[PDB]
Design a protein around this ligand. Structure first.
Ligand SMILES: *[C@@H]1O[C@H](CO)[C@@H](O)[C@H](O)[C@H]1NC(C)=O
Ligand SMILES: *[C@@H]1O[C@H](CO)[C@@H](O)[C@H](O)[C@H]1NC(C)=O
Ligand SMILES: *[C@@H]1O[C@H](CO)[C@@H](O)[C@H](O)[C@H]1NC(C)=O
Lengths: 201, 593
């Protein structure tokens, strides 16, 4: 049959506003036809790294739900968006499990996220008491109590505000320029799998 | 626990320090490449916010006790952060010291000596009097310029230096230092591990040890220069005496490199200037920096960033904005590396491009370090790693490899001798001046020189160490050191001495790494990745390790060695021994004409 009703990847990838990595945006994707040749055929999407499934057989093997997680990090922290990695982003902002089935997509976004005055609208979590569980978010703004004295809501010595700004500027080096990352996580459940790619005649 | 608290404190400090330091460096770049009042005031507020944040964090960092910190990288970061500097005094004394420093800077930048009986011919140092020191051959005009700038700067800077010494001594003793000389020698203090321990009080004797065996080469060079200047000035210079202070090619005698037309060995042999070859092949500044980048990727160090080519200025802009002519390599932070240089298509700017890109490569390599450890191993390392690239870039092998010099070029011994003599006038001749100036400043700050016997001491040691005599007797109302830029503007001067030693140490280590089988001054480190890796082990360190460890990583030694420096100048030293047989090597301390 002739196909319609493509999955809204234009809404996730071509969004005018992404999210900070501490409050990373999650969109569920179901009951549509997901074509992934849109993402591979664009050369600005530099990093297209897939885990558990091959990038070539994305359109035929098909799934129940697809989670698209969008956020912005810097260039050298894209490697932390992978199973089994450690760092600030992996431990405190966005954790993938060790059996992650999906793809990570990242591209440079200087013309959209860098300001000469400095983009102070992208934040990340630098301090947290314990590491994040996989696919967990923390949007809490509680002052990190690193010592023995109680913070009582006021910053200072041994009391730090945990969300620190990615002050993006266009003249930064390539490892510090803003990179937009979309993580596609594919899951199969007991439900009928309703996200399936196109076929031919 | 205290160490984990210090780790989280440094993690909190690094991000705001990097952001504010980038803002300050970008504002300073925007002033330096675009001079106006709004860029100046923007630089002022950016530097004010960054300095205020740094002192605010340093007051909190002094609360940590270092006796319970085990990991030496966190301990070294907290050592770097706890340096309060000039903020250890009260606000009144700090404001008085800043007033003295600012009036010294604005009286050195506006120094003025004017022609007697010709009151319209008033000359500043920077445009016109340096031309007289560099070019003029008349004895009386040089005696005029030297004695006049000595008078109208020393008479105005003697009491300023009198309270400057006392305020700097109070600031240093507020930071648990013995004097301001020990505060400057604390830049060479190394505390990491065992066998890598370096002390401040050790440094002086090491410098003296390295002056124990540069002294014969300097004595032979001094004798040759004295004979050639006696050829220039017939009756005004004595064979057994010291050199007059105003015949040395500079204002202070700091560099002897302007004596090269007077002291050329072989005038019939031309120099190794390849400026006309750049003119004939249509080179521009972009090709100059591309050839420097080709050298740095042939040795194995990484390529230049795209932001380097995008953001730097490599040419006089000529679009109405005023710039500073001095080349400077900028590490703005966050992977931003720029070079400000008004590059003309000459050989000197080609070597300067190699030098400043060596600075940039040194800055790029320790970017993986934390923010407080993104510096040189000490103050001499950073300039030595640019001077070695300037050394390797000027060799005939490098110039023949890149087509600037023809493939059939003949390197006879005479051009090696006069090239080595020009290098000696630049390099060896500045070493007794540097050592004597820093020794004078150390003994002044210590109080070993009495306060009313300053000048009488200084002209003893320039008769003793440098072998340079005053032309006219000076009493204690003069302040003759203070006519120099680095001492009137509060700059450490031993970094040039240690630069000169570390430069030839690094060059011999890289040439043994590159397996060069000839004389050291002909050596090129191009197309040698193993020399680049031997270098980049030290460049990746920063000041994360003690500087003795980085020095052992390059040369295999834990201290300053001048055997590489004497090995560089060995053909010239043999030639100078061969032409000082009849003459008298050395000088006599009493004033001989
Ligand atoms: C985003 O915009 C480009 C612009 O041509 C378009 O080709 C592409 O299909 C859009 N969507 C995605 C998901 O890239
Ligand atoms: C120099 O600074 C002025 C100050 O606003 C600015 O308008 C001008 O564009 C600057 N020049 C360049 C070449 O950026
Ligand atoms: C270094 O490599 C380049 C690569 O083409 C070559 O042109 C050059 O001649 C080499 N240098 C030497 C000294 O052979």
């Amino acid at each position: 049959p002739n196909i319609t009703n493509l999955c809204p990847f234009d809404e996730v990838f071509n969004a005018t506003r992404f999210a900070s990595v501490y409050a990373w945006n999650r969109k569920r994707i179901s009951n549509c036809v997901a074509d992934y040749s849109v993402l591979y055929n664009l050369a600005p999407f530099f990093t297209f790294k897939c885990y558990g499934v091959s990038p070539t057989k994305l359109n035929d093997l098909c799934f129940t739900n697809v989670y698209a997680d969008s956020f912005v990090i810097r260039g050298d922290e894209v490697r932390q968006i992978a199973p089994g990695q450690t760092g600030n982003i992996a431990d405190y902002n966005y954790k993938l499990p060790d059996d992650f089935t999906g793809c990570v997509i990242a591209w440079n976004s200087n013309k959209l996220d860098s300001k000469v005055s400095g983009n102070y609208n992208y934040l990340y979590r630098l301090f947290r008491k314990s590491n994040l569980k996989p696919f967990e978010r923390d949007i809490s703004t509680e002052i990190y109590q690193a010592g023995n004295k109680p913070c009582n809501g006021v910053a200072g010595f041994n009391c730090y505000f945990p969300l620190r700004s990615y002050s993006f500027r266009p003249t930064y080096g390539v490892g510090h320029q803003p990179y937009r990352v979309v993580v596609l996580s594919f899951e199969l459940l007991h439900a009928p799998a309703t996200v399936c790619g196109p076929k031919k005649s | 626990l205290t160490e984990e608290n210090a780790k989280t404190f440094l993690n909190n400090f690094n991000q705001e320090a990097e952001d504010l330091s980038y803002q300050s460096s970008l504002a300073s770049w925007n002033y330096n490449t675009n001079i106006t009042e709004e860029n100046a005031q923007k630089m002022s507020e950016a530097a004010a916010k960054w300095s205020a944040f740094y002192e605010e964090q340093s007051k909190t960092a002094q609360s940590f006790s270092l006796q319970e910190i085990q990991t030496p990288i966190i301990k070294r970061q907290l050592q770097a952060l706890q340096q309060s500097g000039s903020s250890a005094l009260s606000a009144d004394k700090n404001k008085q010291l800043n007033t003295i420093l600012n009036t010294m800077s604005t009286i050195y930048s506006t120094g003025k000596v004017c022609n007697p009986k010709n009151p319209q011919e008033c000359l500043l140092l920077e445009p016109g009097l340096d031309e007289i020191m560099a070019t003029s051959t008349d004895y009386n005009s040089r005696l005029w310029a030297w004695e006049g700038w000595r008078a109208e700067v020393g008479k105005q800077l003697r009491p300023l230096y009198e309270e400057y010494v006392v305020l700097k001594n109070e600031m240093a003793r507020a930071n648990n230092y013995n004097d301001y000389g020990d505060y400057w020698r604390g830049d060479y203090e190394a505390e990491g591990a065992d066998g890598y321990n370096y002390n401040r009080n050790q440094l002086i004797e090491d410098v003296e040890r390295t002056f124990a065996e540069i002294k014969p080469l300097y004595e032979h060079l001094h004798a040759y220069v004295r004979r050639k200047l006696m050829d220039t000035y017939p009756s005004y210079i004595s064979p057994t005496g010291c050199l007059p202070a105003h015949l040395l090619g500079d204002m202070w005698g700091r560099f002897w490199t302007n004596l090269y037309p007077l002291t050329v060995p072989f005038a019939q042999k031309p120099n190794i200037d390849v400026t006309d070859a750049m003119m004939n092949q249509g080179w521009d500044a972009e090709r100059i920096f591309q050839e420097a980048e080709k050298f740095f990727v042939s040795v194995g160090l990484p390529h230049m960033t795209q932001g380097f080519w995008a953001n730097s200025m490599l040419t006089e802009p000529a679009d109405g904005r005023k710039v500073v002519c001095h080349p400077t390599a900028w590490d703005l932070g966050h992977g931003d590396f720029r070079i400000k240089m008004c590059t003309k298509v000459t050989m000197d700017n080609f070597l300067t491009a190699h030098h400043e890109m060596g600075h940039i490569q040194y800055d790029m390599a320790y970017a993986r370090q934390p923010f407080l450890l993104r510096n040189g191993a000490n103050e001499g390392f950073h300039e030595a790693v640019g001077e070695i690239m300037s050394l390797s870039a000027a060799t005939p092998k490098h110039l023949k490899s890149i087509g600037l010099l023809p493939s059939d070029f003949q390197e006879d011994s005479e051009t090696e001798i006069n090239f080595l003599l020009k290098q000696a006038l630049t390099i060896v001749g500045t070493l007794p001046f540097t050592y004597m100036l820093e020794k004078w400043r150390w003994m002044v700050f210590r109080g070993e020189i009495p306060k009313e016997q300053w000048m009488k001491k200084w002209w003893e040691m320039k008769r003793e160490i440098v072998g340079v005599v005053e032309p006219l007797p000076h009493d204690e109302t003069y302040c003759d050191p203070a006519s120099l830029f680095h001492v009137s503007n509060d700059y450490s001067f031993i970094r040039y001495y240690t630069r000169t030693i570390y430069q030839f140490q690094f060059q011999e280590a890289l040439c043994q790494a590159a397996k060069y089988n000839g004389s050291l001054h002909k050596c090129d480190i191009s197309n040698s990745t193993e020399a680049g890796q031997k270098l980049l082990k030290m460049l990746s360190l920063g000041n994360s390790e003690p500087w003795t460890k980085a020095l052992e990583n390059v040369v295999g030694a834990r201290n300053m060695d001048v055997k590489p420096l004497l090995n560089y100048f060995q053909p010239l030293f043999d030639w100078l021994k061969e032409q000082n047989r009849n003459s008298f090597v050395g000088w006599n301390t009493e004033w001989s004409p």
